[PDB]
Design a protein around this ligand. Structure first.
Ligand SMILES: [Mg+2]
Ligand SMILES: [Mg+2]
Length: 676
RNA sequence: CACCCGUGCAAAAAUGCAGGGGUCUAAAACUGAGCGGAUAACCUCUCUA
RNA sequence: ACCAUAGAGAGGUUAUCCGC
């Protein structure tokens, strides 16, 4: 709907006093198309020009298109982004005012252009998405314990030192080793057989402990490095993976090279350690997450290369600082990322562990008590993909009690189209769509056992149908609650990143570990005193805000009045509930008594509000949170004031704060009404 | 259908029209969920040889 | 109720194709 791109203007740039425009090409590559110098302009791309300027007014430039359909559109002047009807021309800056800092962090100097900032914001987007999938991976492993062992690993302690921790007397180190022995002893490692097992008739057997430790250490260090800022040389780790110890290099090699040798594509010898670590990360994820992850990298890195290449035509300085020189190979790392995407496939189960998953399969359905029928249930449950997802990211017995929430299943049955629910109902009881949904919800909640002249194949078809229904309903519900949680994981990742970036700028944000709201308070220029906010709203403060966000009476006021209600302990427990996914681990309890479900936002926040109410039952809470919890226990549905309260640490980025605090803006796929 | 920005026009302080945004948000383009057969190909399950 | 041999069926990967 943006006519500009159709007309062919790809990315408008400011470079000193001049402006450049680019056109799409053979891929996400770019060609520099037009130079503008105040009112003068001249073409650089002489042969096969893509588009031509109609007018060259300093305010805006209208351009017609000779490539493609002859759309004509107007493009705003980058040098006039923040100058107008308020220094008549200046290079624009990001909404966070972080540009001078990010540019001096990644490159050795400021440039007086706005090419470099777009590249850096793509590197920030690379880090943003790994924060989600690294925590989901750690969640998938931690769910098998159904003790912070996973939250703690570092790559400095090779296994030869972790072996020594076997013989320590300190209760911390005995707990650290005992958690490893308990992890190894868990049969649920068969869920990740492509990672934890090796093939050697042939047979697949559990990998040597040194390797399994090197896998846990790698995924844990990646998770820690994504979600937290790392001071010192620990920051460059993902960009200095060449400095990994040989055990981790060899685990990455032998985990990656196996399907490569099956196909022979780049063997583990020449492929980048970054690509190999991304392959390792993908093993813990669902195939949809794998596609989402790996394509996002291909994009980000292709954008990065396109800027690196067009910068050379201008003669701008391309060279990164010595530590970030990782990105100077982004052509190669793009080649390896597409080679990865050529063959990356979801992790298979251990072919022989079917007898182990059997009890999970019957537990998901609540079957306890011929056993031929019981095997017919198990085989088809376990081979499904829904069972893969539910058993990795949920607990079998916990899923069964979740299906008993009538409003939750009656809700998710609304997402299935009417005709498809008729296609599902026809298989179950051989007439309005909502009466189907109601009776089918009862037949999901109160499922007991199969069977609780008709042909044998017909009864087999009925059973297989009701199985695949139940698995699909729970798959959808769990997947959507996970992908909701991922947004707050990105949010707190960005809160932690931007704290460190503001510190380099010079804002006295202080230690954000003690209280997550401190970044918002610092950016608003308010100090809490006697433990509470004291400065009532004054217009004077809004003009002093650091970021371009806020700086308005309405939002500075709504942020301040929500922050006054934002109890620090509640915010920290919300943060931990997000980052560990404890809200959905305890799904059985957090979902009780829910009176209605309006959407996945109202369900996820009901879960969180219930968790926050279950805890803090003894630990005292101040009057406004006591009133929120009373409203929660009165209306049996999520209190909309409470979410806008404990989301206040994100307020320093208003767009995020707003998108997350109210349902109508949360999901781009389900737009809804905004609240004034 | 949210945030920000540039023009035009109300105006008496803020609307409205029409646009832009890799430098806003999971968010610049390149569209998704839906499922019927087909062998090519191998497993797995009950059911009786 | 055991063992591999051997019809039907019912699944999941796998390359080809048709519509909300
Ligand atoms: Mg540290
Ligand atoms: Mg972006």
């Amino acid at each position: 709907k943006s006519m500009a791109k159709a007309a062919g203007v790809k990315s408008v740039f400011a470079v000193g006093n001049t402006v450049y425009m680019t056109s799409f090409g053979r891929g996400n590559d770019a060609v520099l198309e037009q130079k503008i110098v105040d009112t003068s302009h001249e073409p650089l791309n002489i042969d096969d020009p893509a588009y031509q300027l109609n007018v060259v007014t300093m305010n805006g430039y209208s351009v017609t298109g000779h490539r493609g359909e002859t759309v004509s559109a107007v493009t705003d002047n980058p040098l006039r982004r923040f100058n107008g009807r308020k220094p008549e021309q200046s290079v624009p800056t990001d909404m966070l005012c972080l540009k001078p800092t990010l540019e001096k962090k990644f490159f050795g100097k400021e440039f007086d252009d706005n090419i470099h900032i777009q590249l850096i914001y793509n590197i920030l987007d690379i880090e943003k998405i790994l924060a989600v999938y690294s925590t989901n991976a750690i969640y998938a492993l931690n769910n098998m314990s159904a003790s912070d062992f996973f939250m703690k690993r570092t790559t400095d302690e090779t296994f030869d030192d972790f072996e020594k921790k076997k013989e320590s007397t300190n209760s911390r180190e005995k707990a650290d080793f005992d958690a490893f022995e308990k992890f190894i002893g868990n049969y649920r490692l068969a869920y990740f057989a492509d990672a934890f097992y090796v093939n050697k008739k042939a047979k697949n057997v559990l990998r040597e402990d040194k390797e399994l430790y090197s896998v846990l250490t790698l995924i844990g260090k990646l998770r820690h490095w994504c979600v937290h800022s790392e001071e010192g040389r620990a920051e460059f780790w993902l960009y200095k993976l060449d400095e990994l110890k040989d055990d981790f290099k060899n685990v990455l090699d032998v985990v990656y090279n196996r399907p490569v040798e099956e196909i022979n594509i780049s063997y583990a010898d020449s492929v980048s350690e970054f690509t190999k670590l991304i392959y390792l990360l993908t093993r813990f994820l669902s195939g949809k997450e794998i596609n989402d992850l790996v394509t996002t990298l291909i994009n980000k890195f292709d954008n990065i290369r396109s800027f690196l290449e067009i910068m050379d035509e201008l003669g701008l300085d391309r060279t990164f600082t010595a530590e970030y020189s990782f990105f100077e190979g982004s052509t190669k790392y793009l080649a390896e990322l597409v080679e990865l995407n050529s063959f990356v496939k979801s992790c298979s189960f251990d072919i022989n562990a079917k007898r182990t998953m059997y009890r999970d399969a019957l537990d998901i359905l609540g079957i306890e008590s011929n056993n031929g029928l019981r095997n017919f249930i198990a085989s088809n449950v376990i081979d499904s993909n829904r069972f893969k997802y539910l058993v990795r990211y949920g607990n079998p017995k916990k899923i069964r009690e979740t299906a008993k929430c009538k409003p939750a299943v009656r809700f998710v049955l609304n997402e299935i189209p009417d005709a498809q629910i008729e296609r599902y109902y026809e298989a179950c009881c051989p007439c309005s769509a909502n009466k189907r949904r109601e009776k089918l919800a009862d037949m999901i909640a109160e499922i007991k056992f199969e069977n609780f002249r008709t042909s044998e194949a017909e009864i087999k078809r009925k059973n297989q149908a009701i199985i695949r229904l139940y698995l699909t309903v729970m798959y959808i519900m769990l997947k959507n609650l996970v992908n909701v949680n991922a947004r707050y994981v990105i949010a707190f990742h960005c809160v932690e990143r931007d704290t460190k970036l503001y510190a380099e700028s010079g804002l006295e944000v202080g230690n954000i570990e003690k209280n997550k709201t401190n970044l918002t308070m610092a950016v608003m220029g308010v100090k809490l005193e006697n433990g509470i906010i004291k400065t009532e709203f004054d217009k004077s403060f809004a003009e002093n805000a650091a970021n371009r966000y806020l700086r308005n009476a309405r939002w500075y006021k709504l942020i301040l009045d929500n922050l006054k209600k934002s109890e620090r302990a509640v915010v920290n427990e919300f943060r931990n509930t997000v980052c560990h996914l404890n809200a959905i681990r305890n799904i059985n309890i957090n979902i009780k008594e829910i009176k209605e479900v309006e959407n996945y936002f109202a369900l996820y926040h009901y879960l969180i509000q219930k968790h926050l109410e279950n805890r803090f039952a003894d630990k005292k809470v101040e009057r406004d949170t006591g009133d929120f919890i009373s409203k929660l226990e009165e209306h049996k549905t999520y209190c909309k004031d409470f979410v806008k309260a404990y989301c206040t640490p994100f307020g320093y980025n208003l767009v995020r704060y707003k998108n997350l605090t109210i349902d109508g803006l949360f999901d781009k796929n389900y737009p809804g009404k905004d609240d004034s």
